[model samples]
Target: QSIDSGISSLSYNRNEVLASNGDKIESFVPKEGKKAGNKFIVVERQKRSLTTSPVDISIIDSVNDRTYPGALQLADKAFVENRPTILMVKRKPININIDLPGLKGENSIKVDDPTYGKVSGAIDELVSKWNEKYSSTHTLPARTQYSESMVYSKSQISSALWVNAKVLENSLGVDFNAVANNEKKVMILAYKQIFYTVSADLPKNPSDLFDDSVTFNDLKQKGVSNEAPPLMVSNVAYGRTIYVKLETTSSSKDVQAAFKALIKNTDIKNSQQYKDIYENSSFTAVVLGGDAQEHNKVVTKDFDEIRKVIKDNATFSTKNPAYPISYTSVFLKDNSVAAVHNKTDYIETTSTEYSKGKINLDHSGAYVAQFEVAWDEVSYDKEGNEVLTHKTWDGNYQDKTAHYSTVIPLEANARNIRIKAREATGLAWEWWRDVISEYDVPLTNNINVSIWGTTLYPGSSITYN
Candidate 1:
């Protein structure tokens, strides 16, 4: 402390002596790179952190009577021709604001920010450096062993994926036993995801799902097959979730077009709508090898029917374009693209097996069947006539079908159980097929199913009769 004080006294005395003489002494402590002096003069030094030394110390040359810049200022001047000095001059730091979930909006960081460019440059440099260092360890595997969730009971998979399980099984010719048993080489779901916006934004019709303004990312997949299309449906309980029963002939482009049309979004996957479809939506897909029957080694008949009960349900298949016993679509890949392609699907009834059994009802309301699935909404009025409550195409309520009719029970004692299946040009895209032969099994047990909120008995538990 004494030494510093003594030095300060000497500095003050020197300054006093220089000022008293005709030779005027001037000292400059540069504030953000202003010019300094050439001659050395004692400067007032203060206690400072070791981390920060004097920044721009300027001096006056007593002999030359000229000004010289500080060390930092001088270094900056020399390098200013190329770019900015490292520590001397820096642009103001920017705060990056990111919106959660979806990362786009006016509040989010933009592409043109200087801070973003700097960060991107640093990221590129580090990534390139790591790539060079770990180049030997990098590899592209031929097939991915997708191990997300372990295969459990076929019932569990069916219950989780609902109608989608059947749609995938029959359409893609996939084996549920193979999927549940983890059979080698079988085409099964490698992974599945589920996402829902609000029910208020639900599209009025299936076509409305392809609206250009509707965010596309909400419908696209986000898993191994990130670009794959989803099977979409609207539920009174969970808004909308999509599913897709892709055929063997379904190209990625075809699947994508069908997939995006189910959601509202863009042509190229690059658009915000397309990307949003990916971000907002969940996806499910098999690995590169699976989704083919040629790889299966197992088939459990009774369990497969139970699997159908576990998977297929009424409300879940609502407005599903692929749900009909025989459905087809001729998707025209938008006119914007140069090589145009056409995709057509054929889901025809290969066979229908008839049987005699009563679908026991817990409550005594009438039940109606369509697309080989049954739900109870029919009620008897004063005339003992069947009143049917049907759901229209746009999800509106209608008391009857387009035919404005109801099926009268053939016989009170016996119920006809019809099991049917279909075949297509490219791949099996529909479920409930008796033509496969291997899956043909008699329904022996009665399942007590339930719906989400309605009083319908889309039953659940299996009771062996």
Candidate 2:
């Protein structure tokens, strides 16, 4: 029916406008403490649309002075051609580029940097190299260091510089080393984890499992903290999806998300790294003849045995150490009414993570750093075309990934990974990420039960007949 002609028969009051379906239009306050306006809901009649009438939304938005299409869709009477249209709406969420363009590192060229003396001389060279090679968000923000001529001491600092230092430390997940004397502030420790896909073929040793993830220092050329660890290549315990998750920190919670967008950047599925990293997450890690604690901390004795086998110094022991189980809120609770009780037993916990690396196999050296910058067509639109934009992402780093990962193997040739990690460390620090892992918490037996009646005396516990 023509929208105009269909409403012609409707007898409506001054407050309401008629629609084609059997429904009423009553304005409501969408916001609290706000005056009521054209924001109305469709109150349906018996034959709902069969009795009242449908609303014309385009007309309503213009008359109401606001477009609230979502409100209509949420309503029970929202329909297509006067009939309820059942459908879903969604967005393939975009990975936010966290490299806020407005922020950059401070240039505190001190007279006495231990590595780069009076960096004032290398400022131009550093800037050119950083911009040319490390132009993205991963470059450590220059540390803040300034002299307080008023105090005539480098010990005295400025708030702006201090705040700048704090941001770099907290924001980047790396360390800020104060100079030996003073006036020298180093921007470093941008670390990450190395992830790979392998097999659950029972690692002969604990170190073999984390061989690739033990350390990262050879990758850096200057004072950049681009450390990486060995490949903790565990197999696709269940499926092929986990190959990537074994590479990252996707399984964590309690991130500060006071505002939704603030947390979106850390979401894993938003990017290839987060995407792949999510699959292998908390899967499995099978080892030969060893065990771990309730918290998944491996037993040193078993690890020692396993390493011996890996070294061909000993054979595998058929016996495996039994893992432990823990319970939270485990004490017996008081039950008064009935002979009923409940309790909770503890389970297991664990971890993934990585960095942004551009594969320049042609001539560029491998950068074991966890920073990435990319260009993309984003949803932020003008004139219906996704705006072209640059996104700086913060990925991974060492002395931080899961726990404090600190391993620099003396026998580096045991695995190619150590050499590769060393090669990547360049002028960076040697902090690698510990492999965040998961274990099957020792399963618990069925709950023990004892029943009772509610009519027991004040001090008497209920007894079952």
Candidate 3:
């Protein structure tokens, strides 16, 4: 027997056919066949890392009022426009991280040994290091953070490994040498029988290797998805105070000259003269001379004078065809007097002034010639209901029991009159009356009137005629 076999002993020639039933079967003869040579080459396999690209962080400062895209920007717009403007400075951003643990030591065979406990321990340390490093470098101020993990693999390795050299060199040889010929032969046969007994089954497909759902392709397609983080935006208003100022152009000398001129002329106080002056007065000069403030002060001092002036200069006309000519007169004391010419008797006179006050027929019809003593104050009775009392000039001074006639204008198609009180002063109480009940007077001459004791001021014998 030769220790080295010739290379020709390992080679052989044979013919085999691999053809479909319907195809032509081709054959090769020795003389006409083509010669063939074979050579062996090692197949190489590799593990590649499947990782995601670095995430991009964008910073947006909206000081000069620029807009941005995405859900965060939409939320910022809502906070700025719809909500209160005083709370906008405390908005926050979002942070994210991706995990890659499989690339580190996933294919290491040392981890399968129970005695080599350090392998799994090393992996745990590596994951911890990754989390710490990423958090330190990628943290953003006033932002929320999120994290996710994905795994990848190329092929499956066996979960179990066999030590063939340990069995043959350390145990089997010593046992076989001590045996006799037949026993040795039997030992060899048993060794040959059990050599391939512990086999490591290869994976069937890529899915069988590992959890293929977590592969690089799956991760690239659907692994990382966009999600909104919980955050709030705040706004703050800087200045809220406003200032107002008033100025006058007329000098004190001009005002004094005007007052002297008015006192010197008799026409200045006459009804027609005063009307012409009021209607033609320069509003600008009046405003500069503190006309509104001065008029308010004078009316408060003597409201009866103001009432007489309003009555004397009053004008009336018909606006609604169903009604006759009517006039409204508003007093300085926030009271009203309405008179209408009734063509068809409809509203009955209902005032004490009608019976007590003497009527003087003027161009405007029946009127109180003069008010000897007219009380125009509000009052209330014992039961807290309103009651009005009037005293008038009926040529009976000693008769304190006499009251004004209650007969008022009565007409079906009478013109309506309306009166409103203006607050010439900025005082709070004066403004309240002007704003509340001043404009509520009825425009119709057919009105319902009632008199009452004062609730605002008490126990003074004041009456309205």
Prediction 3 global C-alpha lDDT? 0.20
**Of 1 and 3, the candidate ranking higher by lDDT:** 1
lDDT of 2 by residue, 126-153 (tens): 3343344445434232111122111111
For candidate 2, report its TM-score: 0.12
Q: State how far residue 36 of model 3 sits from its true place (Å).
A: 99
The TM-score values for the models, in the order shown, are 0.16, 0.12, 0.12
Tens-digit lDDT track of model 1 for 23-84: 11123121111111211111121211111111111111111111100101112221212121
Candidate 1 vs candidate 3: the TM-score winner is 1
Off by over 4 Å in 1: 1-119, 140-465
Q: Looking at model 2, report the run of 10 residues with the lowest lDDT sum.
A: 237-246
Q: What's the true lDDT of residue 31 in model 3?
A: 18
